[PDB]
Design a protein around this ligand. Sequence first.
Ligand SMILES: O=C1CCc2ccc(OCCCCN3CCN(c4ccccc4)CC3)cc2N1
Length: 554
Amino acid sequence: DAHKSEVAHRFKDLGEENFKALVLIAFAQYLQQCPFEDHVKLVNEVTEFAKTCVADESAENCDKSLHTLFGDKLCTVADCCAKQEPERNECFLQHKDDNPNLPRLVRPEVDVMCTAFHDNEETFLKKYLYEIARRHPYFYAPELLFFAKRYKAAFTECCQAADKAACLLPKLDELRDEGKASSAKQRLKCASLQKFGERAFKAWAVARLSQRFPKAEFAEVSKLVTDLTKVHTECCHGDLLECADDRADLAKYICENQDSISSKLKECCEKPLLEKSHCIAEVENDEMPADLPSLAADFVESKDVCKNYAEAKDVFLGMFLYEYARRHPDYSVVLLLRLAKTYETTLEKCCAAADPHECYAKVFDEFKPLVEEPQNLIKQNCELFEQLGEYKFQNALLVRYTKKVPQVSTPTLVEVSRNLGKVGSKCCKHPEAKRMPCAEDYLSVVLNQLCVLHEKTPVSDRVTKCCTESLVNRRPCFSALEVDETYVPKEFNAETFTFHADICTLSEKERQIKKQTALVELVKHKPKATKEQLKAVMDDFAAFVEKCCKADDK
Ligand SMILES: O=C1CCc2ccc(OCCCCN3CCN(c4ccccc4)CC3)cc2N1
């Protein structure tokens, strides 16, 4: 019922509707260029074959692995198809394009969308899945099903509203916003798994879940981490059916053991299937249990620290991280991992010393400068964010980071510097207790986006170094890059700074993105230009943009 035919097992577990969507997502993420209709046809053939296996597990080919089945179908349409089943899937994952040369989707008129929704609802919702999945080849697949459900509900409600556009546009805009943030967050999970391995992933998971579920026992935290790691390993490896199935299993287990996990899950666990998993994944930290003793008695002052550590290294350090993380919801996850790495380093050298107890007696003192550094960086950047506002703050990042690495492409500089500025909008509104996890964890996400974008088209050996070194040290490494001195400026191209009448039909947001694009190209043309020389240009360009259109002369 769960062994002889894998494709039948997952079809039964997930049901036909989610099965077909997850297969469509997998096909769109592997072959991002193939047209929509072709992928649908392949999905339908896979689905009709899966049904025969449900009817008879011993039917021909029903015993094949999902990768063999899915790989075979894709290869009926790029050297990957000449490879045997293990190496073949790895070749597919390697060719996923993080920024494919696809035209951005132009949202049509609201009436045009609602009429297409009512014409063929099935095709409308499949195209939505397809266009998102092929542009975000690492999107968290079960979470994409949840976005699709909200997308459908928005059209179902608003296309019946008296004012369709006033109802629909705000729901679509926040879905797009939430979808971009979810994509970047999941991309970081897959990058850490692929580049730094499962041990690094599980440590991150131990830290975050201990902060989120501080009342749970270490055995409970470890069990959840193990299952969550399998979920994301499957999803990041393209095992989307297993990933969705295991994620629903995990949500079902969490909800059946609330009493030993958290007091924050009552509401989440009354929601339907897709909403429940989403709700659980973003539930607030539980209150930490009171009267929790200090870590000193068992991790510093104890005489059996070296003995307990040597008997089980990874378990002891995992226990340390769990105990420290549950006590510090106010620390970022990268800080908590750095502190746990410090403890391990101290233990390795001190347990070999002549007097181990004296050697590691002051290990917690070494945490003080590690804690203070991100606290001051955030306190200083939030002030600058308050003096400038988001758009000016983004501009200041644009010039500084363009000078540091002028070889990075202008779209990457614009995207990344804009997202690094949004940290202030997202996090500086919190108190000091919440700023650091908000800011530092958001910085990890956006810096990872820079790393994957640069990995696509490498130009700087220094960016590669920061990206391939310690994940927890990325933000310090990027901050210390220094201005590139040997960069010879590009010859001035007037076609770059020549705006057409089409600029005034764009939204205000797009025009601000175009101004930021010209600002980067300005710095590249004159890297030693001062702030007043750049401000005089941008203020002149902005004035010319408003002028040459408020006056009707085309
Ligand atoms: O596009 C590129 C490519 C070239 C490049 C090289 C280095 C680089 O370093 C960024 C290092 C982190 C900077 N943070 C630090 C703090 N962060 C903040 C903002 C508000 C509130 C709290 C915190 C602002 C931004 C970025 C880029 N960008």
